[PDB]
Amino acid sequence: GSNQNNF
Numbered sequence: 001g002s003n004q005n006n007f
């Protein structure tokens with residue numbers, strides 16, 4: 001799957 005981190 002694809003992963004996105006928005007700090």
Ligand SMILES: [Zn+2]
Nearest residue numbers: 001002003004
């Ligand atoms: Zn993946």
